[PDB]
Amino acid sequence: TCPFYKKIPGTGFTVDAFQYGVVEGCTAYFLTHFHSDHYAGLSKHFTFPVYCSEITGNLLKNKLHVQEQYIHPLPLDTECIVNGVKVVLLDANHCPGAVMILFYLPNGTVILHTGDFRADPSMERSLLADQKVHMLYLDTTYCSPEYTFPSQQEVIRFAINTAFEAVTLNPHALVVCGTYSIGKEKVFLAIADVLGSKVGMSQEKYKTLQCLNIPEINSLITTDMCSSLVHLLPMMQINFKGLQSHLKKCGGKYNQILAFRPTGWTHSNKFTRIADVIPQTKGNISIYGIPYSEHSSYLEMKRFVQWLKPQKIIPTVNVGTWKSRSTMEKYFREWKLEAGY
Ligand code: NI
């Protein structure tokens, strides 16, 4: 059964609610982004209207085979009427195709559902500037002050400089980047650009990237692993055994691997600056964990909420324990007392 924080009151709508069967009263199912915890339950046998971005709809059609007649793509930054209710989709600064949804309820209430997002000051000049929001359904993944990490631009600067140094010292080094979902594509694309290479990958991952509307993608990626010196592998293979095994397959073209594991936050963030990050090394294999986040830090979340000044907040992440829920409620009240709303 569908939980309350996935339902939009006063409408026939749900958000990210495909794992509960037929939801009673639902006339339109919104999907914020193509991550498995959110799309859980969708397939070629789904027969209700799905509303989403163009990129999410390309993924639904090619990867899950949902039939075309049930996919309803909406442009971003554009007022649209769905089943008699005005909605807007906004860029969530998460993975490709990810959106926030503004719902203008028939009674005058305005609701923002962030989906998954990485808050940014540029959102203060979107269509959000123009009116009040009564209720905020918020991605609270990192809602605690210990969750610190650098900007995505600092993280990519570190990765590019690390890779370029290593391969210039040793032209026979291979670079490998882990992946298990869409998102974080700048990590492997930036590294391949500095090295003058295409990115090599499986047919399955090439297919997924071809759905993303990235400019000039045919110039950037390939399934011909032999022509490429940046390879993508599943995240599970990014360890000493998996990387050893991969280097065997390359026919003595290479004699060293440098590998990246983009994670979210890890508690090595509570001590170390990005500049000071070191790898784990065994023999001719070195593995860097790099804190590339597609979710808000605590400080970015707090800035966004204090600017928006919602009347009520409904968390959408960390909702399963009493301790988590209590901690998040404390911070929401601090923020409100500090800013005066
Ligand atoms: Ni996500």
UniProtKB/Swiss-Prot annotation:
What lineage, starting at the top, does this entry show? Eukaryota, Metazoa, Chordata, Craniata, Vertebrata
What is known about the tissue distribution of this protein?
Expressed in brain, heart, kidney, liver, pancreas, placenta and skeletal muscle.
Which family does the UniProt entry place this protein in?
Answer: Belongs to the DNA repair metallo-beta-lactamase (DRMBL) family.
The subcellular location is: Nucleus
Domain of life, per the record? Answer: Eukaryota
Function according to Swiss-Prot or TrEMBL:
May be required for DNA interstrand cross-link repair. Also required for checkpoint mediated cell cycle arrest in early prophase in response to mitotic spindle poisons. Possesses beta-lactamase activity, catalyzing the hydrolysis of penicillin G and nitrocefin. Exhibits no activity towards other beta-lactam antibiotic classes including cephalosporins (cefotaxime) and carbapenems (imipenem).
Summary of subunit composition and partner proteins: Binds constitutively to TP53BP1. Binds CDC27, which is itself a component of the anaphase promoting complex (APC). Binds PIAS1.
Q: Which gene encodes it?
A: DCLRE1A
This protein's species is Homo sapiens
What induces it, per record? During mitosis. The mRNA encoding this protein contains an internal ribosome entry site (IRES) in its 5'-UTR. This 5'-UTR generally suppresses translation while specifically promoting expression during mitosis, when cap-dependent translation may be impaired.
Measured against the full-length protein, the chain present covers: 700 to 1040 of 1040
The identity of this protein, by name, is DNA cross-link repair 1A protein
**Regions crossing the membrane:** none
